[PDB]
DNA sequence: GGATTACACCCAAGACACCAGGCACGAGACAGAAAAAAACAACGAAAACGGCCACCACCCAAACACACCAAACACAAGA
């Protein structure tokens, strides 16, 4: 708790219960912790290996 | 080494320090530092033995001369 800075944020989130498919999608979500500090468009790109 | 990286708006969710060694006071012990005395240097006073002038005699130094040897112009030889 005392190291909230330098800790990953948003690893836990409030489950989305607006509709059923939103819940099913939130339970299957993934996150790359690149951060928005940086305009490198490469890791944002759909890649061949994503198939 | 720092410093900057769209603009506006909506919603939800959690916390809004707890707990542990330092300042003061709280008391011992060798070290930060102070007091003393005894073997350290010198100087005053007495004792007698080492130092200076005689006396003295035998051993080294100088003179005389010896024969002996090293040596130096030159009459002769020589290329």
Quickly describe the structure.
The chain is low in regular secondary structure and 51 residues long. The protein has one helix at 20-26.
What are its keywords?
1 chains; 51 residues; little secondary structure; DNA-binding; transcription/dna/rna; Transcription-DNA-RNA COMPLEX; rnapii; DNA-directed RNA polymerase subunit beta
**Strand fraction:** under 5%
Shape: flat
Strand segment tally: 0
Q: What is the C-alpha radius of gyration, as a whole number of Å?
A: 15 Å
Based on secondary structure, the structural category is little secondary structure
The termini sit apart by: 39 Å
Biggest beta-sheet profile: none
Task: Tell me the number of helical segments per DSSP (H or I, 4 or more residues long).
Answer: 1
Secondary-structure element order, as H and E?
A: H
Relative helix content: 10-25%
PDB class: transcription/dna/rna
Keywords: Transcription-DNA-RNA COMPLEX, rnapii
Entry title: RNA polymerase II elongation complex containing 60 bp upstream DNA loop, stalled at SHL(-1) of the nucleosome
Name: DNA-directed RNA polymerase subunit beta
Task: Characterize the structure shown.
- With 51 residues, the chain is low in regular secondary structure.
- The chain is 14% helix and 0% strand.
- It is built from one helix and no strands.
- The chain has one helix spanning 20-26.
- The longest helix is centred in the middle third of the chain and has 7 residues, at 20-26.
- It is flat and about 35 Å long.
- It binds one DNA strand of 79 nucleotides through residues 2, 14, 36-39.
């Amino acid at each position: 708790q005392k190291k909230a800075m330098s800790s990953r944020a948003g690893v836990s989130q409030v489950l989305n219960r607006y509709t059923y498919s939103s819940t099913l999608s939130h339970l299957r979500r993934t996150n790359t912790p690149i951060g928005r500090d940086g305009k490198l468009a490469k890791p944002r790109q759909l890649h061949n290996t994503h198939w």
